[PDB]
Design an enzyme around this catalytic site. Structure first.
Site, PDB file in Angstrom:
ATOM      1  N   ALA A  96       1.541   2.631  -3.397  1.00 11.05           N
ATOM      2  CA  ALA A  96       0.916   1.933  -3.675  1.00 11.05           C
ATOM      3  C   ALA A  96      -0.329   0.667  -3.281  1.00 11.05           C
ATOM      4  CB  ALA A  96       0.680   1.635  -5.204  1.00 11.05           C
ATOM      5  N   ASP A 138       7.648  -5.173   7.327  1.00 13.07           N
ATOM      6  CA  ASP A 138       7.717  -4.753   6.715  1.00 13.07           C
ATOM      7  C   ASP A 138       6.463  -4.098   6.108  1.00 13.07           C
ATOM      8  OD1 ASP A 138       7.799  -4.949   3.576  1.00 13.07           O
ATOM      9  OD2 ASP A 138       8.040  -6.592   3.335  1.00 13.07           O
ATOM     10  N   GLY A 169      -1.449   0.433  -0.345  1.00 16.45           N
ATOM     11  CA  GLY A 169      -1.536   0.726   1.117  1.00 16.45           C
ATOM     12  C   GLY A 169      -1.198   2.047   2.126  1.00 16.45           C
ATOM     13  N   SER A 191       2.695   6.221   2.835  1.00 12.84           N
ATOM     14  CA  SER A 191       1.830   5.117   1.415  1.00 12.84           C
ATOM     15  C   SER A 191       2.623   5.075   0.636  1.00 12.84           C
ATOM     16  CB  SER A 191       0.954   7.140   1.181  1.00 12.84           C
ATOM     17  OG  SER A 191      -0.478   6.996   1.500  1.00 12.84           O
ATOM     18  N   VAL A 233       1.906   8.351   8.505  1.00 12.16           N
ATOM     19  CA  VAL A 233       3.528   8.203   8.076  1.00 12.16           C
ATOM     20  C   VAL A 233       4.261   7.346   6.983  1.00 12.16           C
ATOM     21  CG1 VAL A 233       3.939   8.651  11.127  1.00 12.16           C
ATOM     22  CG2 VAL A 233       3.078   6.619   9.761  1.00 12.16           C
TER      23      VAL A 233
END
Ligand SMILES: CC(C)(C)c1cc(NC(=O)Nc2cccc(Cl)c2Cl)n(-c2ccccc2)n1
Length: 337
Positions: free
Chosen positions: A33, A157, A35, A31, A29
């Site tokens: 830098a 977040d 994770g 992506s 769902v």
């Protein structure tokens, strides 16, 4: 050391996720830098979940401290309107193999980009709790608010992207929600963000869609007016000069921007979008505003347990950040089901 490190439960798919077998139907769902996140179904609980694989979590000191910071944060958050850890796990069987961290929470219906009163209420109730443990969010926006079937909401977040001026997530700028004190120069910087979000919920459109920083301010000032005497004195950076030199514009009647809205809502927005942050309404004050009279109960709006963030000042090696996080992973206990 932990049960799972004796229980051959881990399988592997590229999406390169190694996760226990209870977690099935993985589905990307998002992506960045820092994770990745998948939705998935947990066969143990029967519920749907999200999972974040941190990317190269102990590769740099930035990632390492950040990894520890997020896990410590999520392990402390026990509140209905804030993201809560259902699980944290690693394929590692010992510290020597400890290279990846995976966190699991509830998948809530979708996100965000009398239902407005209810949502906003929920956001502030979660913000009172975040702020009470001395955490500022700093990046509240619709994509950081997850909601379920019943318009029941949780602040979160994703934290997948490096924070930059011109940042974007889908077709939304981060700067559209920035408190102008940040953009230019307290905890109410989150309240600025809340008010811009509530405006969007009422009208269907972005309150302050600036192309860039000067456009953004002009749009802000177009709405709320130029600063008065007191705010100007408190602005410590002389180049104050710039906003003082701007032709005075008058605040709009918010009633005619937010045509037809609850008078109480319009009054609350005015108290949220004040330029001077020493006078902006706080989360705890705003929950007691009469707009929420049907939801407000001060005693069901708890603050957090003391939050020990003395680690933020410490200069630690990567492997100490790693080993401190390992302990937190291995001692994690899932919330009472
Ligand atoms: C408590 C609050 C301030 C709202 C917060 C929450 C988070 N982290 C998250 O919201 N993480 C997150 C988001 C979506 C899905 C999943 Cl599985 C996760 Cl683990 N962080 C966070 C901290 C540090 C780095 C990245 C994220 N901070």
């Amino acid at each position: 050391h932990h049960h799972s490190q004796e229980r051959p439960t881990f399988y592997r798919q590229e999406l390169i996720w190694e996760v226990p077998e209870r977690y099935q139907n993985l589905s990307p769902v998002g992506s960045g830098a820092y994770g990745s996140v998948c939705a998935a179904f947990d066969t143990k609980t029967g519920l749907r979940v999200a999972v974040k694989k941190l990317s190269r979590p102990f590769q740099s000191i930035i990632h390492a401290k950040r990894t520890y910071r997020e896990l410590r944060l999520l392990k402390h958050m026990k509140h209905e309107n804030v993201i809560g850890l259902l699980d944290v796990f690693t394929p590692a069987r010992s510290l020597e193999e400890f290279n990846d961290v995976y966190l699991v929470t509830h998948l809530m219906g979708a996100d965000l980009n009398d239902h407005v009163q209810f949502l906003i209420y929920q956001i502030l109730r979660g913000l009172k709790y975040i702020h009470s443990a001395d955490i500022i969010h700093r990046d509240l926006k619709p994509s950081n608010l997850a909601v379920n079937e019943d318009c029941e909401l949780k602040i979160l977040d994703f934290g997948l992207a490096r924070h930059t001026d011109d940042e974007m997530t889908g077709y939304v700028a981060t700067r559209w929600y920035r408190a102008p004190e940040i953009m230019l120069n307290n905890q109410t910087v989150d309240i600025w963000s809340v008010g811009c979000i509530m405006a969007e919920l009422l009208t269907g459109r972005t309150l302050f869609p600036g192309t860039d920083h000067i456009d953004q301010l002009k749009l802000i000032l177009r709405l709320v007016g130029t600063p008065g005497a007191e705010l100007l004195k408190k602005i410590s950076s002389e180049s104050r000069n710039y906003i003082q030199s701007l032709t005075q514009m008058p605040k709009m009647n918010f009633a005619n921007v937010f045509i037809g809205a609850n008078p109480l809502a319009v009054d609350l927005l005015e108290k949220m979008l004040v330029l001077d942050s020493d006078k902006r309404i706080t989360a705890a004050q705003a929950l007691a505003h009469a707009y929420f009279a049907q939801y407000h109960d001060p005693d069901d709006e708890p603050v957090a347990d003391p939050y020990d963030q003395s680690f933020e000042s410490r200069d630690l090696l990567i492997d100490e950040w790693k080993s401190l996080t390992y302990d937190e992973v291995i001692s994690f206990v899932p919330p009472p089901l």
